[PDB]
Design a protein around this ligand. Structure first.
Ligand SMILES: Nc1ncnc2c1ncn2[C@@H]1O[C@H](COP(=O)(O)OP(=O)(O)NP(=O)(O)O)[C@@H](O)[C@H]1O
Ligand SMILES: [Mg+2]
Ligand SMILES: [Mg+2]
Length: 299
């Protein structure tokens, strides 16, 4: 850290204690976050930020460099052919993909499946020139359980069928049981901590994303405070997916908020499931049919 213009040994200690350990968190910080450190004047705060930006090289980019930026994105297989396809390859990192369906349409199932697929090295698609094996080594997932529907059996099961060790998934998956929007949001914010503890967090799950809010703010008259709270949570989720190049997933049950990829899932006949991609930045709307069996998502 002392590499940063103005930053010395003492200051370095302050910054590391306030959460700012790496450059990108400093290069993308606001002169406010940093000054609120006390001892970190608005003067030095601007200087270290101008600097951290430079080192990380956050300027204007054009031509072929734009493709280089877009290749730092890796994807995760959902274990469905039609779904990965509709996904344009699979679940993207640096973005928040949301599955919003009806009761028992499969949201939680897709969530579990992903935790498992993360421990299957072959299920992460990327360009090795922009994303080295080391970056995706010992990936771990954080599962913020809102409804209390995390089921370790179901993990073990999906693993066994995938041909991998379920105990290995359980060992690399952090589950946090949230009972309300405060715990939910906080757990989310506390993820940056597991990463500084040396945890290669690459998958984040919020099941559900919109449950606690609806319950805490049913009053459709105090909607403001709510939508603010929820939107601020999303901002954290996105920033989190960008800076730590990791896939973030959220579920939303339905019979407004930011989410870079929007899916609407519904039950079919029996196993059959219909996932409808109605919103995304570069892909056309489309439907993906898959199913859920003892093996998880398949076809
Ligand atoms: N071990 C299993 N073997 C076969 N099917 C299973 C298994 N576990 C769960 N399912 C299927 O998963 C369905 C439930 O899907 P689920 O992931 O709970 O949807 P959901 O989006 O979470 N619904 P909700 O939480 O109520 O909003 C069941 O009704 C089963 O068909
Ligand atoms: Mg993004
Ligand atoms: Mg659910």
């Amino acid at each position: 850290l002392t590499d940063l213009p103005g930053v010395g040994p003492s200051t370095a200690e302050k910054l590391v204690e306030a959460g700012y350990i790496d450059f990108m968190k400093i290069a993308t910080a606001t002169v406010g976050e940093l000054t609120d450190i006390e001892g970190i004047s608005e003067k030095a705060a601007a200087k270290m930020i101008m600097g951290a930006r430079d080192l990380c090289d956050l300027g204007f980019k054009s031509g072929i460099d734009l493709l280089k930026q877009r290749s730092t994105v890796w994807k995760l297989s959902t274990s469905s052919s039609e779904l990965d396809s509709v996904l344009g390859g699979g679940l993207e990192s640096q973005s928040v993909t949301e599955f919003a369906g009806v009761f028992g349409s499969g949201k939680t199932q897709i969530m579990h499946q992903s935790c498992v697929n993360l421990q299957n090295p072959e299920f992460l698609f990327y360009d090795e020139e922009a994303v080295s094996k080391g970056e995706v080594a010992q990936p771990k997932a954080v599962y913020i359980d809102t409804d209390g529907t995390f089921r370790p059996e179901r993990i073990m099961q999906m693993a066994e069928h995938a041909g991998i060790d379920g105990q290995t998934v359980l060992d690399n998956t952090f589950v946090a049981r949230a009972y309300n929007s405060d715990m939910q949001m906080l757990f989310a914010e506390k993820i940056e901590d597991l990463i500084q503890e040396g945890n290669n967090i690459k998958l984040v799950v919020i099941d559900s994303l919109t449950s606690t809010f609806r319950n805490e703010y049913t009053g459709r008259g105090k909607l403001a405070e709510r939508q603010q709270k929820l939107g601020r949570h999303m901002a954290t989720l996105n920033k989190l997916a960008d800076l730590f190049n990791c896939v973030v997933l959220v579920t939303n049950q339905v019979s407004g908020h930011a989410a870079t990829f929007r899916f609407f899932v519904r039950k079919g006949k029996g196993d059959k499931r219909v996932a409808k991609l109605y919103d995304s930045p570069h892909l056309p709307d489309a439907e993906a049919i898959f199913r859920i069996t003892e093996k998880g998502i398949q076809d």
